[PDB]
């Protein structure tokens, strides 16, 4: 039906996080509590101040983000919020259809503003869906300020919500993207500023990514906005 998806999330919510598991679309998740703070990965764990607590706060992680078991996900969408290719489609699949049917309710998504579901089979609880900028290697004044936006508005449903975990993905970067090195800057600017005053609402931001490039680039600048030394 269409709104089998009402009950799926009330029958997930009834559940304790152990019972969760067993419905989960792979049995590989990762829990939280094995993912590295930014302060163990920069002691080899497998002008900003530095903060103690920050570093227990950020995390990167190169993985599956479909398969971290945290509060919610971000799905960096297309307008239409019904998948489609790349990790979107990825995360429509995992979830399995009632993460679709859900969409299918909601309105389309305006560039840098995010809106929230249900998780369903995902170990994630919720997914966040958010609609970045198209920069063409070129990112206006205006589009880097649209991609600050979906990870601001992304944050504030997590605060809606009173979730307190979230995974990001690297929003807006691929083939006619945002530059790499560049939305990194801004990724890692807006969470110091956004943990400094909203420290206590959560116990992890994760910068998940899945290539290689981006890792290196997030592992090189976090010493800068998240000095550990």
Known sequence: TST?????????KGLSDKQREEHY?????????????????????????KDKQLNEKISLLRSDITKLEVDAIVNAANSSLLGGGGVDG???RAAGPLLTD?????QSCKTGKAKITGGYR?????????????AYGE?????????RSCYL??????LEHRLRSVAFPCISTGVFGYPCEAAAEIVLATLREW???HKDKVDRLIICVFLEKDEDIYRSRLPHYFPVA
């Not at 089998?4 to 997930?12: C, G, I, M, Q, R």
């Not at 859900?102 to 909601?106: A, G, K, Q, V, Y």
């Not at 990112?139 to 991609?147: D, H, T």
Request: aromatic share 10%; net charge positive; with cysteine.
């Open 4 to 12: 089998d998806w009402k009950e799926a999330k009330s029958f997930l």
């Open 25 to 49: 679309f792979c049995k590989d998740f990762v829990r939280l509590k094995k993912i590295p703070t930014w302060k163990e990965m920069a002691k080899g764990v497998a002008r900003y101040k």
């Open 90 to 92: 990825c995360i429509h």
């Open 102 to 106: 859900e969409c299918r309710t909601l």
């Open 122 to 134: 995902l170990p994630a609880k919720y997914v966040i869906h958010t609609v970045g900028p198209i």
């Open 139 to 147: 990112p206006s004044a205006s589009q880097a300020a649209e991609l």
């Open 153 to 158: 508005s992304s944050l504030d449903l997590l």
């Open 195 to 197: 943990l400094e005053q």
